[PDB]
């Protein structure tokens, strides 16, 4: 039926209503840190986002996401392999039902307990729509989860959940700022991929960080506690929302970092 995480409905069967799903630049990817390349050309990423506005937290039945104000330059991406600038959209996660597991990308195969990821579109094409159909529309900033000490600026998240329980569930979240949610350190991995997520579109430059934060054992099992189902349904729990590695093909991964 329609797509999802299940036997019946995974990520090895998308590609009958997704075909894109056996393409050349599919993500994630396991990024191998030997055979990445060093490319010294490659710029600081600039993130700004003192001027974010969060809008809305919203489970949309696969993940949950927080909105943006995306109207203006309030909260940008430039720098890095990126031209232009690209405006913040939304985030979300993925995760895993135990702590070795929920990451999509993997470096030298090691999985973490969930991924981060933030979603960007170039501004040269108006709106998101467009940019979804172009191979420079979108930077996602992935960014790992291990599980450790807490991550105090993912608490207020955490705690909104309870709210957003089941499919189709939204909040006012107001004031979020997302500049908590970063590592000490910008050094990344990048490569030309796409969604992890139906549609699959090939659109995407990848901007993998190298350092992952830590969240506490508490804060992810509070992920784990969502649903996939609408109110009212059997309950299924939302874990192990993560496509896994796809073939690299004719791609390389270029590290900003010796
Ligand atoms: O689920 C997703 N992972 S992603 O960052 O590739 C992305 C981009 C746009 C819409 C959804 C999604
Ligand atoms: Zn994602």
Redesign the pocket.
């Known amino acids: 039926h329609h797509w999802g995480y299940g036997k019946h409905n995974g990520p090895e069967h998308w590609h009958k209503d997704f075909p894109i799903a056996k393409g050349e630049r599919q993500?994630p990817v396991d990024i191998d840190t030997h055979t990445a390349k060093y490319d010294p050309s490659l710029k600081p990423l600039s993130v700004s986002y003192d001027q974010a506005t969060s809008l809305r937290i919203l489970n949309n039945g696969?993940?949950f996401?927080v909105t943006f104000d995306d109207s203006q330059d309030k909260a940008v991406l430039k720098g890095g392999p990126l031209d232009g600038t690209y405006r913040l959209?939304?985030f979300?996660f993925?995760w895993g039902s135990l702590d070795g597991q929920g990451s999509?990308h993997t470096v030298d195969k090691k999985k973490y307990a969930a991924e981060l990821?933030?979603?960007h579109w170039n501004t040269k094409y108006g709106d998101v729509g467009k940019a979804?159909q172009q191979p420079d529309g979108?930077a996602?900033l992935?960014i790992f989860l291990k599980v450790g000490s807490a991550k105090p600026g993912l608490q207020k998240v955490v705690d909104v959940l309870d709210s957003i329980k089941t499919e189709g569930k939204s909040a006012d979240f107001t004031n979020f700022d997302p500049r908590g949610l970063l590592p000490e350190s910008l050094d990344y991995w990048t490569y030309p991929?796409?969604?992890?997520?139906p549609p699959l579109?090939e659109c995407?430059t990848?901007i993998v960080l190298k350092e992952p934060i830590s969240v506490s054992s508490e804060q992810v099992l509070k992920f784990r506690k969502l649903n996939f189902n609408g109110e009212g349904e059997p309950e299924e729990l939302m874990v192990d929302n993560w496509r896994p590695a796809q073939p690299l093909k004719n791609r390389q991964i270029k590290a900003s970092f010796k």
């Open positions: 993500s696969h993940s996401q959209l939304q979300h993925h999509e990821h933030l979603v979804v979108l996602v992935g991929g796409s969604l992890t997520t579109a995407v990848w």
